[PDB]
Design a protein around this nucleic acid. Sequence first.
DNA 1: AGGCTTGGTCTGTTTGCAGCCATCGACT
DNA 2: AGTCGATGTTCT
RNA 3: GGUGCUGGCCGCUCUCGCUAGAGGGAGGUCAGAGCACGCUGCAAACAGACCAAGCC
Length: 861
Amino acid sequence: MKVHEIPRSQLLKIKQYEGSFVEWYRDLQEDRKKFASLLFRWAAFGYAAREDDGATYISPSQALLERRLLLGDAEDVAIKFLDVLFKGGAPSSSCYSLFYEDFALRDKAKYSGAKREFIEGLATMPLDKIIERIRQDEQLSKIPAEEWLILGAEYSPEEIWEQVAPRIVNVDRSLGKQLRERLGIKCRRPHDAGYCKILMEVVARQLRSHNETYHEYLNQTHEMKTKVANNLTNEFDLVCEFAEVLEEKNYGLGWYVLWQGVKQALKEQKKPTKIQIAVDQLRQPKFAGLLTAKWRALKGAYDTWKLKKRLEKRKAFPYMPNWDNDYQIPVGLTGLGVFTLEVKRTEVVVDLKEHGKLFCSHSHYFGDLTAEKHPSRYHLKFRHKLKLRKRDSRVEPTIGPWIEAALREITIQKKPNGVFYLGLPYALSHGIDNFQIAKRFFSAAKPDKEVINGLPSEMVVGAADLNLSNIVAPVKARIGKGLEGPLHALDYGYGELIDGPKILTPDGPRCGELISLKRDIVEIKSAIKEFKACQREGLTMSEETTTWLSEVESPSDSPRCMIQSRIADTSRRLNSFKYQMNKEGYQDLAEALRLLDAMDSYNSLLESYQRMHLSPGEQSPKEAKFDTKRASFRDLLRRRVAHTIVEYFDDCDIVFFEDLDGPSDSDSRNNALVKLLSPRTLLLYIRQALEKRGIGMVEVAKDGTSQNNPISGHVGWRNKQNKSEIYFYEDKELLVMDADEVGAMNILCRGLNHSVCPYSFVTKAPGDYGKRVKRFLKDRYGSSNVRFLVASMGFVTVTTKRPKDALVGKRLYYHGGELVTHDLHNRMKDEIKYLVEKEVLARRVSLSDSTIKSYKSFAHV
DNA sequence: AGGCTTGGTCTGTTTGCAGCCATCGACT
DNA sequence: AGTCGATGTTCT
RNA sequence: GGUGCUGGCCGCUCUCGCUAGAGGGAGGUCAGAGCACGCUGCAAACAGACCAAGCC
Ligand SMILES: [Mg+2]
């Protein structure tokens, strides 16, 4: 079967070093360091020079100046050298040649494997297959197919090679040797192939990381000045004229500031609102051409101004990369540096043959590690144990499973504390089938039919919905060609469900009073300004905030110190529950979550008590205390969300998730999840722990997955006071279920639909739809080039003719099979919204039921 | 008391570049 | 047999 | 048995202060383990947090 390896690495703290290495490391982080800032100029990279006063703005012409002013003669070769260096990969086979002083060349090109296969079948190979092999080969075109053909007919295969190798050689490999002598280039060590071979690719490994950014950072400047001057309307002609006369008067302009300006200026309103400076400038004649603008044609003139102002804050070219910080030095078995390795008294040892031996410590991640050398790879076998602090604890150390893997190179780094670490970039022999199916089959709209036939009969899926509430609600399922069932999967068949959907981490107990503890910090932020706003006016304080302050046993009624006792009593609460949760190791994520935010508002509060005394206009330059906690903690919770999500998804082959970082609706900027814990870092941290077990992961859209009904597709209402419940109107009977459960089904639904079944899209006139939108209109109604008609009851119809009466350039919603419009999707929400308000009784419907024959959401048949 | 816009200073958050080497030929 | 230098590819 | 994460106590220092106290910060010190673990360099865009004004 086909396998695919997965790159991972975990630390190893080095204790002692032996030999001349210490100088050796310091030389590479000085040889790298030394020449990287010189090679910067050779490709003429336009660079800002970092400075406290600003950033100087050097241009390519101001940098191409010193290219020939630094190399008068190597220029005509260096440009050929940089390309054969920027291509990289390995066909640049020996770029190290310039550093190595004894660099020898051979007069023959090497006998490559693909260079052998081409000669023995030179007699019969067709020219419409001979020329498609060589055209794409760097060494083969240099001889035209004429003299290629003659040797195949006359000569037996083995004789031909003896006379073509000095002809098809890649003459770029000499470019390195010339530059050293013509430039007087000396490194620190020069007969040492290791020192050279590593350093060449190492500096290159840091440089190519800058070239592709360079042409990509630029190609944005070419796409940004295209999409600012493509939407210049007579509405842009006066929208930016609004901010010019706003900054002179010392003001600015926002987004939701926009809609209450014309509604108060279209009826004589003599009592201003928060935007009177706009309303008084929305009564002048030069901005009276703005009050009369349309509905949607102004959202497409707000983004350009919100896009143009990003063109002006952006620098014209990248900064200069700072190279002083130590880089992760890699050393590999074959070709690069040479190393051997052992486990000495369960303590790791590393040996480098020319330059002496490192020393190493016993590690917990590799708990029962073993090593056996094979000629190309190291084979490791180990498991994960726990970390053993207590000696007479009844507590067994958690045993991980054994891991069979391969390892071929090692990494080294100094940390700012002066410690040398050692890394192990290891590869995992795992089945590629799950990944192979993941990208090609579920991600995309239509896979080729030779790919669809790459499926076994039955396989397992999963999904969940994650919001800040009770985070994980999974559902496992079974999909089958043979087996019939209630969920429709595109191109694979029907499926029937094993477990789920259930919530797995319900919000723990201590949360209820920790939010109640957050409110205690909520009032301290608004109250500290009351001590600071009456210091400027001369007034006293409000009793309602004062009455709250007295709730503490405070030995002084002074307003100042009672503030401090509500906070010391608050810090103790955080200090205490810190301890009693540290006992556990944080086994309830849902608990630590509302605690994490509680740890946030406390640190967010101490920055206003240090700045209480400050008279108006003098600040405190709060410095980095390199709080190591808040950074390396909120990571731990994410790498702990894996364990609860992996445990329930081990037996699955594929997983699905809600990608909350995509084109979402408007309420997702203030949302805490983009603020509290990264979606993609969490989804990727799941992927990294899912890839580890050879289980594919494929995201799907985030557009209204919580909203739709899994059974009937009809709309629902996420209760605006209780986000955990959601309501539905079907069959003249009201129903209710759990929202963050509902989302798990709609993600499982949309997953088996390849995200094809849409939620909302924008019309045009038969500006094209994406390839994932097409397969819906073609499969159901008949084609892609279709206009849409408003019809009886205010529905929408798909017409196979293309008339001009119809609505074009608008927006829709999809429910149960019917294409409905926007003024109806409000009405449809309005249908449930009113029934709940009138205090009617609904019927809860679990989705674990068997009475359901088929789920009709995101399926078309 | 609260509700935005502007800017500065400081960390913190979310991304796409580079990478995780095999094989012959000369020589022991 | 074995070491270490120097050399080899191409689709999205 | 490598990196994380935690509270008391001690002083030390720092900041304010209706005088009551609080809050930091790198280390010296008393307590707790059913806690997961892709390491790393260059780069770029937002948002988050506090002091200032004008404005309704
Ligand atoms: Mg949700």
